[PDB]
Amino acid sequence: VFLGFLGAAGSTMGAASMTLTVQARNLLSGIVQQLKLTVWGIKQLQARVLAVERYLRDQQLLGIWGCSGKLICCTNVPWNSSWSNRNLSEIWDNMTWLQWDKEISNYTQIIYGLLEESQNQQEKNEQDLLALD
Amino acid sequence: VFLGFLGAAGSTMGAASMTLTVQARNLLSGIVQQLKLTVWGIKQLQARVLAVERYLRDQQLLGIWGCSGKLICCTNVPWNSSWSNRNLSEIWDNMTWLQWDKEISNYTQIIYGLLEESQNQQEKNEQDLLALD
Amino acid sequence: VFLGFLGAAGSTMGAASMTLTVQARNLLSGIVQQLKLTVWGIKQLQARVLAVERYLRDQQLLGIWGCSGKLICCTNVPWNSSWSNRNLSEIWDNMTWLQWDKEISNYTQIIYGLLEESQNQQEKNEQDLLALD
Amino acid sequence: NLWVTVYYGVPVWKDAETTLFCASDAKAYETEKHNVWATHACVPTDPNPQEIHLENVTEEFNMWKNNMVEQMHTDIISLWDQSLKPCVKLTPLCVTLQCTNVTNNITDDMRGELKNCSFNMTTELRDKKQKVYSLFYRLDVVQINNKEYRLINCNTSAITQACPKVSFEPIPIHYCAPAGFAILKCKDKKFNGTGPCPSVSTVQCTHGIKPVVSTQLLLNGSLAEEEVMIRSENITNNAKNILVQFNTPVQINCTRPNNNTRKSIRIGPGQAFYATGDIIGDIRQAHCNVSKATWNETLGKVVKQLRKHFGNNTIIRFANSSGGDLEVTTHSFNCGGEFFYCNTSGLFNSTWISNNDSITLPCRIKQIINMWQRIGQAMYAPPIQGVIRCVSNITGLILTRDGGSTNSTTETFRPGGGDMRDNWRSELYKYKVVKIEPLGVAPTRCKRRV
Ligand SMILES: *[C@@H]1O[C@H](CO)[C@@H](O[C@@H]2O[C@H](CO)[C@@H](O[C@@H]3O[C@H](CO[C@H]4O[C@H](CO)[C@@H](O)[C@H](O[C@H]5O[C@H](CO)[C@@H](O)[C@H](O)[C@@H]5O)[C@@H]4O)[C@@H](O)[C@H](O[C@H]4O[C@H](CO)[C@@H](O)[C@H](O)[C@@H]4O[C@H]4O[C@H](CO)[C@@H](O)[C@H](O)[C@@H]4O)[C@@H]3O)[C@H](O)[C@H]2NC(C)=O)[C@H](O)[C@H]1NC(C)=O
Ligand SMILES: *[C@@H]1O[C@H](CO)[C@@H](O[C@@H]2O[C@H](CO)[C@@H](O[C@@H]3O[C@H](CO[C@H]4O[C@H](CO)[C@@H](O)[C@H](O)[C@@H]4O)[C@@H](O)[C@H](O[C@H]4O[C@H](CO)[C@@H](O)[C@H](O)[C@@H]4O)[C@@H]3O)[C@H](O)[C@H]2NC(C)=O)[C@H](O)[C@H]1NC(C)=O
Ligand SMILES: *[C@@H]1O[C@H](CO)[C@@H](O[C@@H]2O[C@H](CO)[C@@H](O[C@@H]3O[C@H](CO)[C@@H](O)[C@H](O)[C@@H]3O)[C@H](O)[C@H]2NC(C)=O)[C@H](O)[C@H]1NC(C)=O
Ligand SMILES: *[C@@H]1O[C@H](CO)[C@@H](O[C@@H]2O[C@H](CO)[C@@H](O[C@@H]3O[C@H](CO)[C@@H](O)[C@H](O)[C@@H]3O)[C@H](O)[C@H]2NC(C)=O)[C@H](O)[C@H]1NC(C)=O
Ligand SMILES: *[C@@H]1O[C@H](CO)[C@@H](O[C@@H]2O[C@H](CO)[C@@H](O[C@@H]3O[C@H](CO)[C@@H](O)[C@H](O)[C@@H]3O)[C@H](O)[C@H]2NC(C)=O)[C@H](O)[C@H]1NC(C)=O
Ligand SMILES: *[C@@H]1O[C@H](CO)[C@@H](O[C@@H]2O[C@H](CO)[C@@H](O[C@@H]3O[C@H](CO)[C@@H](O)[C@H](O)[C@@H]3O)[C@H](O)[C@H]2NC(C)=O)[C@H](O)[C@H]1NC(C)=O
Ligand SMILES: *[C@@H]1O[C@H](CO)[C@@H](O[C@@H]2O[C@H](CO)[C@@H](O[C@@H]3O[C@H](CO)[C@@H](O)[C@H](O)[C@@H]3O)[C@H](O)[C@H]2NC(C)=O)[C@H](O)[C@H]1NC(C)=O
Ligand SMILES: *[C@@H]1O[C@H](CO)[C@@H](O[C@@H]2O[C@H](CO)[C@@H](O)[C@H](O)[C@H]2NC(C)=O)[C@H](O)[C@H]1NC(C)=O
Ligand SMILES: *[C@@H]1O[C@H](CO)[C@@H](O[C@@H]2O[C@H](CO)[C@@H](O)[C@H](O)[C@H]2NC(C)=O)[C@H](O)[C@H]1NC(C)=O
Ligand SMILES: *[C@@H]1O[C@H](CO)[C@@H](O[C@@H]2O[C@H](CO)[C@@H](O)[C@H](O)[C@H]2NC(C)=O)[C@H](O)[C@H]1NC(C)=O
Ligand SMILES: *[C@@H]1O[C@H](CO)[C@@H](O[C@@H]2O[C@H](CO)[C@@H](O)[C@H](O)[C@H]2NC(C)=O)[C@H](O)[C@H]1NC(C)=O
Ligand SMILES: *[C@@H]1O[C@H](CO)[C@@H](O[C@@H]2O[C@H](CO)[C@@H](O)[C@H](O)[C@H]2NC(C)=O)[C@H](O)[C@H]1NC(C)=O
Ligand SMILES: *[C@@H]1O[C@H](CO)[C@@H](O[C@@H]2O[C@H](CO)[C@@H](O)[C@H](O)[C@H]2NC(C)=O)[C@H](O)[C@H]1NC(C)=O
Ligand SMILES: *[C@@H]1O[C@H](CO)[C@@H](O[C@@H]2O[C@H](CO)[C@@H](O)[C@H](O)[C@H]2NC(C)=O)[C@H](O)[C@H]1NC(C)=O
Ligand SMILES: *[C@@H]1O[C@H](CO)[C@@H](O[C@@H]2O[C@H](CO)[C@@H](O)[C@H](O)[C@H]2NC(C)=O)[C@H](O)[C@H]1NC(C)=O
Ligand SMILES: *[C@@H]1O[C@H](CO)[C@@H](O)[C@H](O)[C@H]1NC(C)=O
Ligand SMILES: *[C@@H]1O[C@H](CO)[C@@H](O)[C@H](O)[C@H]1NC(C)=O
Ligand SMILES: *[C@@H]1O[C@H](CO)[C@@H](O)[C@H](O)[C@H]1NC(C)=O
Ligand SMILES: *[C@@H]1O[C@H](CO)[C@@H](O)[C@H](O)[C@H]1NC(C)=O
Ligand SMILES: *[C@@H]1O[C@H](CO)[C@@H](O)[C@H](O)[C@H]1NC(C)=O
């Protein structure tokens, strides 16, 4: 369904689970076009550099959690329940993304580290192992 | 054959179909190196930011038409003939890229939308389906 | 082993062969945050643009040597021994990356060209061949 | 059949505008206000100006609708600017000058051509004043109502003496295009100026372009090949200009044969003004020599080419310009640092039917130059010490028509203009910027639909 930019903000997470691209497109705004010092000129350029910098930070994060085939990354290792344990219906029948981030805001830096370290290192050097026969 | 930058401009599209990388390399010019206001300084920086901005716009487009394994993307869905229907020989034995873009210049924004929406959404959530068994 | 940024500099190449990500993370420094002309302002921005420019140059190189699944690219074609022929133990039991680059510094631009041309063109148009049946 | 396919790397461009940055070589040393010209902040050129001729290409150019001339013109203005921000602001000069004649040779073969002016002036101390004196070219001093005179641009503009470190020696500038763009160069020796050029090449960036400032005469420019082309969007219109471009560098020798002395006056604190102390040596008149023979022959080549646009049944007349402001009446240019205004009557003084010695051109020397017809701004060249001897080609021409009244055989052309952007279009006519779109959609037997 064509919601639009943030169009699924007022929807359960599984609802927004289909409209991901619409936000991604707005990460350059195309034509933007945005002359001496020119107040609003420095602003224009500082804006664009901020935008690409922002974009590249997270694209880097995804490079690290090596998927690049984004919107979905899935492996076969279980998940830790300690971090605000909740039910399936408590998420998909009871929560939208907004309310969800309020609760998950604590464990982010934790999760970043192990998704970074564990799979990258394990999937590493096994390709090195199978590069023999 | 080592044509060079745009070296296959005067060639049928299938001819240029082998020299794609040569243009891609020129998308940073390396050493470029291009101090107060310094007319040509603002020019230098505004140039570089324009370059990476340009690069990232299209790299984004390719991110959306999710391939990233560029120069070729192919699926198994048919193609619409309505848009300036022509023959195979009318393209490879009768046309170079230059003449081709003149004719295709109308349907671009159309094509962008469905290549963006259709395959992304269909290939989406099926990975979600096969993440069960 | 958690060495850290460049932490495996004083180690054989196979040792550093596990700590690759740690340098990659430092390619944006996150919070950096780095107002009129403001000496150190122009410096800040010129720095950030230099950083992303640097990043994108090599990411481009990797785009060309089309892997994007980085840290390892491997095919089945032999390798030329002419370029400073050495032994396996002469590398993994006798050399760290530092000492290695001193010796390989000559053949870089050579290697870049064939890794760019050969596999890209061969793996090209064969996908075009198998797009028939 | 035919189905949809995406490519990346498709050598296709569009006509576009973008910004182009300079590219130079490392020779940045001179002695009048900063640097060489501006060009020392420039990125050094690649030692291999790589080009590539593009087979089979046919692209229409429009040397009259190109944009690069516009960027270039603004940037040259601004660089002149930046060179003139940091050096002394000569406002307290605009003072009542006590001037008399400089008794040049009896009776008169310099007619003075310069007055001797003393004046009050501030000092190092914002206190008891000083009385100095200096020699000014009577072309930049104006009366009121000895007699009291003043600087010309004063009641209209401020003045800004260039200090002694930049040059005005034009240095080859290489307009270079930022990544993702391309520069197209028309390789066709025979090109009108517009329309489809069949033989073309791509370069990463252009040749050295001597950014000489000149009027009525393209100096040091490039030369045409095998012919002397004529360029103008609408020759049949009398309101454009004709851009002639020679095959043969017709020499011209210009000189100022004085040993002139630099007298420094401290407009304190710290600011110092360079006046014309005195003149020693052979007091000839500043001038320029040209081989009459080559000029006549080559202008006959021009007769042929002008005929080819007007019929072998015509008579063409070259007259001098019909008067007006100085900056258009004369061949004005810069040379060894100085600014020359050469009267060119001695070069367009002939009607021409259907079918050593050398020419001397008497030129005057100006100081308070108003560059680019801009008002409110005024540079003040300093008296360049020594003798000036300066040699150059003349490669092209800039003409203006007045005919189409009883328009049968006798057409009269006179030189003029005053917009440098003509000068600039004369060397960028072969050049065009294109934006690259390495994204491509095309049909092959790869398949997707709606
Ligand atoms: C169209 O293009 C043509 C070229 O294609 C241009 O022709 C150029 O015209 C200029 C104007 O004259 C020439 O530059 C100046 O030439 C002066 C004459 O000196 C020359 O002759 C003497 C005697 O034969 C030689 O000794 C000189 O050689 C020595 O000096 C030069 C320059 O210093 C060195 O490079 C040599 O290695 C020798 O050491 C010359 O051959 C010359 O005085 C002048 O030099 C001053 O100006 C430059 C830049 O303006 C300064 O960087 C330099 O330091 C000098 O300025 C300082 O020194 C003097 C010394 O008295 C002081 O008085 C000054 O105040 C300052 O402190 C410069 O070389 C040029 O040579 C010539 N092109 C060629 C290829 O020869 C046309 O100009 C152009 N069209 C137009 C309309 O301009
Ligand atoms: C601007 O000013 C410059 C310098 O004043 C002029 O450049 C000079 O141009 C003249 C015209 O060609 C040159 O004169 C000729 O040079 C030829 C080659 O030079 C050799 O011979 C001379 C002796 O003449 C030697 O000193 C020199 O080292 C070379 O070995 C000579 O062959 C010519 O001589 C022939 O013609 C004359 C007729 O004039 C005969 O009398 C001779 O017998 C012989 O048949 C002649 O000398 C001169 O060389 C150039 N200068 C320099 C330094 O070389 C520009 O022409 C001038 N431009 C304008 C528009 O005025
Ligand atoms: C600045 O330079 C000017 C000339 O360039 C000097 O002008 C002179 O000024 C003096 C006054 O200081 C004038 O003297 C006056 O003469 C009249 C009649 O003789 C007398 O009635 C007055 O009382 C006064 O004495 C003099 O005429 C005048 N000369 C000219 C040619 O204008 C001026 O003195 C200089 N100022 C400084 C500070 O150096
Ligand atoms: C280049 O400039 C010339 C003018 O020197 C243009 O020619 C002029 O064109 C206009 C209309 O395009 C003419 O107006 C009308 O023309 C008709 C037919 O000639 C006439 O019967 C009318 O009375 C009226 O004048 C004008 O006469 C004509 N002038 C000349 C001298 O030819 C020309 O069109 C310009 N180039 C281009 C490409 O437009
Ligand atoms: C411009 O005109 C002024 C006059 O208003 C000239 O200034 C004066 O020029 C004379 C000679 O031309 C100098 O004469 C000397 O005077 C001293 C003291 O009286 C005497 O002892 C010497 O033997 C000699 O006769 C006088 O100094 C000078 N005055 C000043 C203030 O400089 C000036 O020469 C003219 N400009 C030029 C370029 O000729
Ligand atoms: C540019 O140079 C030309 C010459 O190359 C100058 O034109 C000359 O101007 C004078 C004065 O107007 C003409 O003199 C005339 O002589 C006749 C006969 O004696 C007399 O009756 C007139 O009253 C006038 O005095 C002279 O003929 C003329 N030369 C030519 C070849 O036409 C011109 O003034 C110069 N202009 C500039 C801006 O440098
Ligand atoms: C271009 O060449 C022409 C022809 O030599 C010059 O035109 C002539 O200019 C002179 C003055 O320079 C004119 O003299 C006239 O004298 C009367 C009587 O004193 C005066 O009232 C006028 O105002 C005018 O000055 C002469 O009539 C005129 N003749 C022609 C046929 O145009 C012109 O000056 C030269 N210009 C340059 C830049 O070389
Ligand atoms: C699942 O998460 C819990 C906490 O959210 C982890 O408990 C940690 O256990 C280590 C090892 O004893 C302690 O050092 C930490 O202090 C514990 N965490 C906290 C917040 O106190 C638990 O280890 C995680 N599961 C696994 C398998 O490691
Ligand atoms: C192939 O393209 C044609 C036009 O290029 C499409 O025709 C459109 O059909 C829809 C549905 O009736 C109309 O709303 C549009 O107005 C039509 N297009 C135009 C330009 O009028 C056709 O639908 C496409 N093929 C498929 C299968 O959708
Ligand atoms: C392996 O490398 C060597 C040199 O490092 C290559 O030798 C080149 O051979 C070509 C063809 O005769 C010559 O034009 C070059 O001059 C040689 N190189 C040098 C440095 O002289 C050799 O060709 C490479 N292996 C293969 C299979 O090509
Ligand atoms: C100073 O220079 C001027 C420049 O022309 C000379 O002009 C004199 O002007 C008056 C006008 O009132 C005429 O009556 C004179 O005939 C002109 N003189 C000449 C020689 O033509 C003026 O003569 C010069 N003064 C001195 C003292 O040389
Ligand atoms: C531009 O070049 C063309 C030829 O290259 C000149 O003449 C053209 O002639 C064709 C007929 O073969 C006409 O269809 C074109 O319209 C002409 N060109 C123009 C611009 O009208 C032409 O004279 C040249 N342009 C100029 C101003 O001289
Ligand atoms: C130039 O003069 C000739 C004869 O005096 C005229 O005749 C042309 O001559 C050229 C030779 O260069 C031929 O190529 C043409 O085919 C001839 N055409 C005609 C109609 O005779 C020619 O017309 C004159 N050119 C102009 C522009 O007036
Ligand atoms: C310019 O052309 C004219 C005409 O061909 C030459 O003739 C001069 O014409 C004027 C007109 O009044 C006379 O006063 C002169 O006396 C004529 N010259 C001579 C030598 O008598 C004139 O010589 C040419 N001058 C230039 C500089 O080209
Ligand atoms: C006018 O342009 C010509 C272009 O030919 C310049 O000629 C050069 O002269 C030098 C020495 O005579 C040669 O080494 C160059 O090869 C010549 N250029 C070319 C393209 O062959 C000439 O220098 C220019 N005029 C002046 C006064 O410098
Ligand atoms: C997150 O941490 C804050 C910090 O005090 C705490 O108040 C909040 O309850 C925590 N929420 C969850 C879901 O852990
Ligand atoms: C396309 O060209 C082939 C070449 O043989 C021909 O058989 C076919 O009929 C053509 N079809 C169309 C639609 O032009
Ligand atoms: C593209 O659209 C323009 C707009 O009028 C039209 O003139 C042109 O013929 C169209 N070309 C094709 C191939 O549809
Ligand atoms: C690399 O090239 C330099 C250039 O002279 C040479 O001195 C050095 O020995 C070379 N090293 C190798 C390993 O080829
Ligand atoms: C130039 O030469 C031609 C013949 O070559 C001649 O008719 C003409 O009169 C000459 N120019 C002058 C000013 O004499």
UniProtKB/TrEMBL annotation, chains A, B, C:
Q: Which residue spans adopt a coiled-coil conformation according to this UniProt entry?
A: 102-133
Q: Which residue ranges traverse the bilayer? A: 1-18
Bilayer topology annotation = Single-pass type I membrane protein
Q: Where is this region: Fusion peptide?
A: 1-15
**Subcellular location(s) per record:** Virion membrane; Host cell membrane; Host endosome membrane
Protein origin, superkingdom: Viruses
Cysteines paired by S-S bonds: C67-C73
Question: Which positions does UniProt annotate with glycan attachment?
Answer: N80, N87, N94, N106
Record region (Immunosuppression)? 43-61
Show where the Retroviral envelope protein GP41-like domain sits.
Answer: 13-133
UniProt protein name: Transmembrane protein gp41
Tell me which species this is from.
Human immunodeficiency virus type 1 (HIV-1)
Automatic annotation (TrEMBL), chain D:
Q: Sorted alphabetically, which keywords does the UniProt record give?
A: Viral envelope protein, Virion
Detail the disulphide connectivity of this chain as listed in its UniProt entry.
C22-C42, C87-C163, C94-C154, C99-C117, C176-C205, C186-C197, C254-C288, C335-C390, C342-C363
Q: What is this protein called?
A: Envelope glycoprotein
Q: Which organism is it from?
A: Simian-Human immunodeficiency virus
Recite the lineage of the species. Answer: Viruses, Riboviria, Pararnavirae, Artverviricota, Revtraviricetes
Q: Which gene encodes it?
A: env
Of the parent protein, the shown chain spans: 32 to 502 of 706
